[PDB]
């Protein structure tokens, strides 16, 4: 095992979260969210690591040496970190839904695409070889889902038809109902074909105009107008925390990670963005 | 007969010390080609402290190196601190251009080395920096930061040599060899090719470094115009011997791509006693004194 | 990709050809600018009732309206206001036949028999929550086309 | 025995008709193999004499003209003007050589009287004006190479190859 | 011969990759990727060798002698390495695609140029006459592709048109024959003309800004701003391992490389960069 | 690559900048240039194009002024600064589509003259919307920067 | 239990008499489906005995024998001289894997006395003269694979692999 | 010089013969490239007057007429009322462009003075009446493109388009 411990976790957004990768060449008015290689939102593991590390260094002020061993020193480093974060893969995003007719309707649903689940499969397969970990349960669920890659499906529900984000009609096929839930909320999960999924997900993002106002005269200050992109509340990302054997990794994994529940990612935290719940796949599944 | 050395990847022919990055030569020296060929043909029983004796025994007369880009043939040409690759169609009028008039001289030669120069269309200089890491800290091991300017190829390039013996030209075909410096790779391929020999022209092109016997150094130097019309004369090391793990020698040489006058031949022929005559005959056997005619592709050794 | 704009293009094509007198076109333009905001505020069913009430669904105009679904040579006759409300009604019904909300055979068999337009209104009342969400962009495109192409008084 | 003949290729429009035995046999020296024009003969000491273009023989090796070699004799109205010759394929040096030549063939080159009226104001000319390539390819590059548009299709490359390779020297008048 | 056998393999980026090079201010990116000679991303042979050597020394601490004498002993340099890697050549980089009235609506495709395929064919030709390394079908596909050079080519014959990386409109045509897929991925491969291909590929790279934040006041530290280039997930590099005849090479190639699937390449592994899958072209195709 | 687009944008801006004779129309066009590219790349090209033409007051006189701009360079746009600025921006987009072979110039000039073919123009533009939006961003941003640099802030 | 025997693939034909039951169970790892061969085991450190080719255990890691693992009892005249060993299906060197195996399985190997009265100097041996595989396919690949010529019609591709995917080291003794 | 002729495509029976060339050479701009009709000409401001059908000119841009352009000279009963004129193959409003243009042309068009005793009441006429396309297949698409049935096995393709790729304003009176 190249890695002592391997814990995948989910990144349920409690509030809207805004991770940066700031203005592009063209849209100098926008502050966009961090994007994946194939266009979906993502959280770079550098942002994950920085935020979680800054959080741990205050929440556990007495285990600071364990944290500096596993997540790297920062005063004068004399060796590499023993811990790695993978980039957060978008796992499921909430979308407003208008269900035609079925059992008592929902007003929102979780939307995912086959490409996202394929990236989750890649993460899980790669770390099941670099570790003694084996997530055969999550992997079996994801492969049962990826078996039906052509058709837009829905999990443990029928719905047979829907309008997503009040712009996209989808026809849904109930998979088999034998596959139990994954992110076990009450809401269903739609696995969309990626062409329509890209549009649905892009609509489920949040673009917000913001301004700055003169204090004395309550008028917009010259230039104070811009746009920002938020990931909505309830959005679920997927990542893995990996560690090499240290006896500080055992402490980190059995003490720090078992008591790490809410952290604060990304920016604009003073306007309430960034609160996040971690879920540690090894127990939520 | 003809051997094409096709580099699979950027190459490194380290020259002139290591002390931003260490620079690579354009055309590998004949010692490198001879050493690669001897590496193929080696047998671990003929060892002797004379690296070039055991090397001359392993092969036959090798004729100097030039460039085959895409059917075209490029040849080195230097004016003094100015290397270039030109197609022979621009070497034809060169001697005429040599003692041509002054402003015409510079017009022509600087049009040759700059616009007719096909070097940069062919060659890129690729700096590569490497480091070493200690297997317990996972941070850069101290003092291990090295750099080297490799020789990358924009289009497919071959180094062309001609070997006389045809017996080795069977167990040389299709060999993947460790051509050059820091563990780089090239493929050898052998093909029958027709090349004239030993034409009696006035101006030859040094396809390889013409060595100087260190006895006529003062003689050859104090009247230099009598032998080289254009090119560079420099003290070069002869490389590194695999058997004894040392540098080889240092000799003044006429760097490849120089324009030599016919007189040089007789000069070299008159300043070698039997001992160093045999020595430099070996040197020429492995490929140092190769001349080509500005007329056409026709080679000849100086001594042999 | 916004195919409701193409649907609006073809529907607007049909009704822009079926309105001979320019006053009818200008009336349709006013209808288009008003009824989309009306269906936003008031819902689909009240606006649909208002529309069919001001449309004068006689078998004559009903037949011209049915023929519009096929011909592209049909014409809407009547007063400018009447034909504008009938044109907007055809716009809505065209969106409904496309997008498969209502079978075309049912729509035609209802526009023929007076004892079946009531069943048509009943089906539309049952489906109104879906229609209200679906047709917003289509009607906004209709309005944009109207105020782009038809001049105003 | 075989005879060949030299066709000089300038931008000059003095090419209209000089050859009648265009194929004659089946083999001609030059060729094009999907990577440019092969066997382009360089000739030194000759230059174009633009007035009804031909090759003045001057006494500077710096002066050189490039051309092609095709089977046959031109029009049999000359050899009072052309410099017909025979060589063992060894003293003429071309580029792009592919096969070993038959060790002896004849040559027909358009030759010009020396006729020193004024000094030959020699100039270098590199091929330009894509339109001239487009009309000369229909002119000669096909009347000889009937192979063209049958086997060779990379037409823009044999345009790309002569504009910077094919060059010649001139008299300015 | 003293290079008796050759092992061609593929390098699939599981996560983003950053094999760094000389950081300097001439490229609007502080930490650029290793450029090949044509501006394409490449992995130097030294980086491959060192990374795989470290990985093998960690994973098989008993075969350490075999590994030392095949990939070069460090503490006893007296004997050349019996194994050698060629520079990894970019074989295909993923690109975001917008279909235009086509049959199979894809969201991303693999993009290549003709320069890259020429280099791949060079590597393949130079090792095909080793009497065991045969793989005729692969270079036959490459040659069928190279014949069509000049035209933007698609392998799976359904696109006819597309917009690549949201910015480049290209028209595609089939190969007059199905040309069975090079890789077994269910994503079409696009061989582009080189001029437009360089643009598509250079746009397929990830350029990230990174910062250093003071732990206390969540302000950015002075000077802690820089940019890095990554190579996206799904990116494919092509390299060859060459081995001399010695018998430790035989046991190396036998049971060191058969159990070698995932490896860490490049730097920034604590950010989860560098997880790579090695596919040997001796079993797949 | 889209580097000729800066030259294209310079000349198209010079056209519409001389065509707008009222300075208030210049400032209106400035606001259009700064709003409509944002909206094109946030809502899509087709929604924003419908919005532009609805606001352009495409009557035959204005369309003739447009065509004259396409040809004359002495033309002048009239009609209610809001409308004239939306029509100037319509001309910006159409001028791009003409000078880039996306739309045949004769078919466009036919569309801006007849009436049945205006819907045909809109339908064709609809089928070319992904291509147009992908290809025109550099040009539209150049127009935006030119309008911010040359027309005084109102 | 589930049990298999490893059958070699030489250019000599004594091979078809090495098994009794064709299928036995319902699990064959070595299966071919429309691309090529799969799950062929490659033993190392053994040397063939082509005159009744039986893998003599040598010590040279460079020596190897590539053959297929098939379920069946070996000859029912063995288990006194064959090499019988059960191994947990994960430490087994097999190339071109397609699916995971049953985590443990019993293997029968053709064996012999080392014959230490003859210097075992092995020799790299290919499978050429495609007639010598032409016959053994209709000999082995029909009594082991009925699925060929009822699912395999591109037999040329089951030729173009045994051509080079199957080599070994023989002893010529 | 190379010159073309424009055969209008109306519904009525003016399309029997108007030509002196049926094939003549091979260069027609209108082609049937397995996908329908390419390089179709459009004249604007003109209207067919199917009573002795030859394009009557108007000054209304909505008035137009579509037709296919072929090489020839019309029936040699003309030069009295036809507007033969020289266009550089680009100024003509051509639709459905597949090939390119020769950059210089000269076309003949069936013209008629507008006989100004009538108000030119032009109205659109769409090609329909499936038994009329059945004869348009023969009367022009065979007396010109007898290429019909030579490579066009999908005639029922190239009838869908003519049913919609043509339309014109007619005097209707």
Coordinates of N, CA and C in Angstrom, one line a residue, chain A residues 1-2 37-39 44-46 49 53 57 74 81 83-87 115 119 126 129-130 193-195 198 244 266 269, chain E residues 14-16 55 58-59 96-98 105-108 206 208 210 215 218 232-234 261-262 264 269-273 275:
Chain A
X1 N 0.8 -1.2 0.0 CA 0.0 0.0 0.0 C 0.8 1.3 0.0
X2 N 0.8 2.0 -1.1 CA 1.4 3.3 -1.2 C 0.8 4.3 -0.2
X37 N -12.0 20.0 -15.9 CA -11.5 19.9 -17.3 C -12.6 19.9 -18.3
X38 N -13.7 19.2 -18.0 CA -14.8 19.1 -18.9 C -16.0 20.0 -18.6
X39 N -15.7 21.1 -17.8 CA -16.6 22.2 -17.7 C -17.4 22.3 -16.4
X44 N -10.4 22.7 -6.5 CA -9.1 22.3 -6.6 C -8.6 21.8 -5.2
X45 N -7.8 20.7 -5.2 CA -7.3 20.2 -4.0 C -6.4 21.2 -3.2
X46 N -5.9 22.2 -3.9 CA -5.1 23.2 -3.2 C -6.0 24.1 -2.4
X49 N -7.2 21.8 0.6 CA -6.1 21.6 1.5 C -5.9 22.8 2.4
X53 N -6.8 22.8 6.3 CA -5.6 22.9 7.1 C -5.7 24.1 8.0
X57 N -5.9 23.8 12.1 CA -4.9 24.4 13.0 C -5.5 25.3 14.1
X74 N 4.5 24.7 7.5 CA 4.5 25.9 6.7 C 5.4 27.0 7.2
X81 N 4.6 16.9 2.8 CA 3.4 16.4 3.5 C 3.3 15.0 3.4
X83 N 0.1 13.8 3.6 CA -1.3 13.7 3.2 C -1.6 14.4 1.9
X84 N -2.4 13.8 1.1 CA -2.8 14.4 -0.2 C -4.3 14.5 -0.2
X85 N -4.8 15.6 -0.8 CA -6.2 15.7 -1.2 C -6.4 15.6 -2.7
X86 N -7.4 14.8 -3.1 CA -7.8 14.8 -4.5 C -8.7 16.0 -4.8
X87 N -8.7 16.4 -6.0 CA -9.7 17.5 -6.4 C -11.1 17.1 -6.2
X115 N -20.5 11.3 -16.9 CA -19.1 11.7 -16.9 C -18.6 11.9 -15.4
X119 N -15.7 9.8 -13.4 CA -14.5 10.3 -12.7 C -14.5 9.8 -11.3
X126 N -8.4 3.9 -8.7 CA -7.0 4.2 -8.5 C -6.6 4.1 -7.1
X129 N -6.1 0.6 -5.4 CA -4.9 -0.1 -5.7 C -3.7 0.5 -5.0
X130 N -3.7 1.8 -4.7 CA -2.7 2.5 -4.0 C -2.9 2.4 -2.5
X193 N -27.9 12.0 -19.1 CA -27.0 12.1 -20.2 C -26.2 13.4 -20.2
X194 N -25.0 13.4 -20.5 CA -24.1 14.5 -20.2 C -24.4 15.7 -21.1
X195 N -25.0 15.5 -22.3 CA -25.3 16.7 -23.1 C -26.4 17.5 -22.4
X198 N -25.0 18.8 -18.8 CA -24.3 20.0 -18.8 C -25.1 21.3 -18.8
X244 N 0.2 8.6 4.0 CA 1.2 7.6 4.1 C 1.5 7.4 5.6
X266 N -13.5 28.0 0.3 CA -13.6 29.2 -0.6 C -13.7 30.5 0.0
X269 N -16.6 34.5 2.7 CA -17.2 33.9 3.9 C -17.9 34.9 4.8
Chain E
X14 N -4.9 10.1 -14.3 CA -6.1 9.9 -13.5 C -6.6 11.2 -12.8
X15 N -5.6 11.9 -12.3 CA -5.8 13.3 -11.8 C -5.1 14.2 -12.7
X16 N -5.2 15.5 -12.5 CA -4.4 16.5 -13.2 C -2.9 16.2 -12.9
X55 N 8.7 4.9 -7.0 CA 7.5 4.2 -6.7 C 7.8 2.7 -6.6
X58 N 9.6 1.9 -3.3 CA 8.7 1.8 -2.2 C 7.8 0.6 -2.2
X59 N 7.2 0.2 -3.4 CA 6.2 -0.8 -3.4 C 6.8 -2.2 -3.3
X96 N -13.2 19.9 -24.6 CA -14.7 20.1 -24.5 C -15.2 20.3 -25.9
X97 N -16.3 19.7 -26.2 CA -16.9 19.7 -27.5 C -18.4 20.2 -27.4
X98 N -18.8 21.0 -28.3 CA -20.2 21.3 -28.6 C -20.6 20.7 -29.9
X105 N -24.5 12.9 -29.3 CA -24.1 14.1 -28.6 C -23.1 13.9 -27.5
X106 N -21.8 14.3 -27.8 CA -20.8 14.1 -26.8 C -20.5 15.5 -26.1
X107 N -19.9 15.4 -25.0 CA -19.5 16.6 -24.2 C -18.0 16.8 -24.3
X108 N -17.2 15.8 -24.5 CA -15.8 15.9 -24.6 C -15.3 14.9 -25.6
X206 N -4.9 23.4 -18.2 CA -5.5 24.1 -17.0 C -4.5 25.1 -16.5
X208 N -4.0 27.7 -13.5 CA -4.6 28.0 -12.2 C -3.8 29.1 -11.5
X210 N -2.8 30.5 -7.8 CA -2.7 29.9 -6.4 C -2.2 31.0 -5.5
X215 N -2.6 32.4 8.0 CA -3.5 31.6 8.8 C -4.4 32.4 9.7
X218 N -6.7 35.6 7.6 CA -7.3 35.2 6.2 C -7.0 36.3 5.2
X232 N -4.8 18.0 -18.0 CA -6.1 17.5 -17.4 C -6.1 16.1 -17.2
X233 N -7.1 15.6 -16.4 CA -7.5 14.2 -16.3 C -7.7 13.7 -17.8
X234 N -7.6 12.4 -17.9 CA -7.9 11.7 -19.2 C -6.8 11.9 -20.2
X261 N 0.3 -0.7 -12.3 CA -0.8 -0.1 -13.0 C -0.8 1.4 -12.7
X262 N -0.8 1.8 -11.5 CA -0.9 3.2 -11.1 C 0.4 3.6 -10.5
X264 N 2.8 7.6 -9.4 CA 2.7 9.0 -9.1 C 3.8 9.6 -10.0
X269 N 2.0 16.4 -5.4 CA 1.2 15.3 -5.1 C 0.3 15.5 -3.9
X270 N 0.7 16.4 -3.0 CA -0.2 16.7 -1.9 C -1.5 17.4 -2.3
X271 N -1.5 18.1 -3.5 CA -2.6 18.7 -4.1 C -3.3 17.6 -5.0
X272 N -2.9 16.3 -4.8 CA -3.5 15.3 -5.6 C -3.1 15.3 -7.0
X273 N -2.1 16.0 -7.5 CA -1.7 16.0 -8.8 C -0.8 14.7 -9.0
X275 N -1.5 11.3 -10.2 CA -1.9 9.9 -10.3 C -2.1 9.5 -11.7

